[PDB]
Nucleic acid binder design. Structure first.
Ligand SMILES: O=c1ccn([C@H]2C[C@H](O)[C@@H](COP(=O)(O)NP(=O)(O)OP(=O)(O)O)O2)c(=O)[nH]1
Ligand SMILES: [Cl-]
Ligand SMILES: [Cl-]
Ligand SMILES: [Cl-]
Ligand SMILES: [Cl-]
Ligand SMILES: [Mg+2]
Ligand SMILES: [Mg+2]
Ligand code: NA
Ligand code: NA
Length: 326
DNA sequence: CCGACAGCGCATCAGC
DNA sequence: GCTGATGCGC
DNA sequence: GTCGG
């Protein structure tokens, strides 16, 4: 955290462009800049020094100079003092409420947590659950609790069918000491790119996890992706653990590596890797890596037997999960 | 200067 | 009912 | 907002 003040600023700017300005490219520009500076091993002394890094342009260089000199950014000072912007940024912190819905509610006068609770009828299912656990979803999950959750999920899945393989990905797989949520990759031999020999593969797992009262709510659910809420069991006389967000993704077993690569992230790392892939003549998604024909159209899936194989195709030295936190 | 900026699942809606 | 566009999230 | 060509 040598340049914590600077990356925080960029992150706030990014959030402003996404939530308030609805300028997604600026949002990603600020995030990339924050990401490149976050791994820079020196305490930045000036915007010029920063401009040397890829992703940091003139505009950001000037802001970094203003920040280093005064310790703040006038542009952000004003944004903070602006009711509308402040309200919109806040409402987007509720899962299910995005920039559009946030601005829509703010236009209706609904701009505080209190307002949301009294107008619960104006929220869809997801937003309603996000509001319900607003506080809990803000807390981090210690890795020790993640290990507990992992044991529960792997053991409950095993009980449904010994052939299932549940892998915890996301920040957890990257070795994080704390995670925002739990991300679970799921595979079963009956579900491949060639066929789905068994229906409800994801449903059954969800069902079992709900039966043992691990999963408490559902935000969204389909044939291959479950988005919900879970909670560790507490002991007698013991205070209850906070409710946690849990994501489960069922991927074709023969496409596990592209899947675990995707789900392990980070998101910025995935963006960088997928962008680099293109420059090399390939396109990567969570299922496959395909070559790009002279017309730009994606060819057929290339053989893959490990995460490393994907890195080789794009001429990138393999990077352990723990080093993909960009 | 200009176009590119990663890729996709689920929920909701408009138009038919 | 369907398809396609859009919002939101991973 | 930044970048390559
Ligand atoms: O925009 C996105 C979001 C997520 N992802 C992938 C990578 C990410 O690591 C994974 C899980 O998403 P989360 O939002 O759960 N993030 P992560 O687990 O990395 O961190 P956190 O501790 O915040 O959950 O999904 C993308 O590829 N693109
Ligand atoms: Cl933009
Ligand atoms: Cl500031
Ligand atoms: Cl694969
Ligand atoms: Cl594909
Ligand atoms: Mg996660
Ligand atoms: Mg997640
Ligand atoms: Na730069
Ligand atoms: Na939100």
């Amino acid at each position: 955290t040598l340049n914590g003040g600077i990356t925080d600023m960029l992150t706030e700017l990014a959030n402003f462009e996404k939530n308030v300005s609805q300028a997604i490219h600026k949002y990603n520009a600020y995030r990339k800049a924050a990401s490149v500076i976050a791994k820079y091993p020196h305490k930045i002394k000036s915007g010029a020094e920063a401009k040397k890094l890829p992703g940091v342009g003139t505009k950001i260089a000037e802001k970094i100079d203003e920040f280093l000199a005064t310790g703040k950014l006038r542009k952000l000072e004003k944004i903070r003092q602006d009711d509308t912007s402040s309200s919109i940024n806040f409402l987007t912190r509720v899962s299910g409420i995005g920039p559009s819905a946030a601005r829509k509610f703010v236009d209706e006068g609904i701009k505080t947590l209190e307002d949301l609770r009294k107008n619960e009828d104006k929220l869809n299912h997801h937003q309603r659950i996000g509001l319900k656990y607003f506080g809990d979803f803000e807390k981090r999950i210690p890795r020790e609790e993640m290990l507990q959750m992992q044991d529960i999920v792997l053991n409950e899945v095993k009980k449904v069918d010994s052939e299932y393989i549940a892998t915890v990905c996301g920040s957890f797989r990257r070795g994080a000491e704390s995670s925002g949520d739990m991300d679970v990759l799921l595979t079963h031999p009956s579900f491949t790119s060639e066929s789905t020999k068994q229906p409800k593969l994801l449903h059954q797992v969800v069902e079992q996890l709900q039966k043992v009262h691990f999963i408490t709510d559902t935000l969204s659910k389909g044939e291959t992706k479950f988005m919900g809420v879970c909670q560790l069991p507490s002991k007698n006389d013991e205070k209850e653990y906070p409710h946690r967000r849990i994501d489960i993704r069922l991927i074709p077993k023969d496409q596990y590596y592209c899947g675990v690569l995707y789900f392990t992230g980070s998101d910025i790392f995935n963006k960088n890797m997928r962008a680099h892939a293109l420059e090399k003549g390939f396109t990567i998604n969570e299922y496959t890596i395909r070559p790009l024909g002279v017309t730009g159209v994606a060819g057929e899936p290339l053989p893959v037997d490990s995460e490393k194989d994907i890195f080789d195709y794009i001429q990138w030295k393999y990077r352990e999960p723990k080093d993909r936190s960009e």
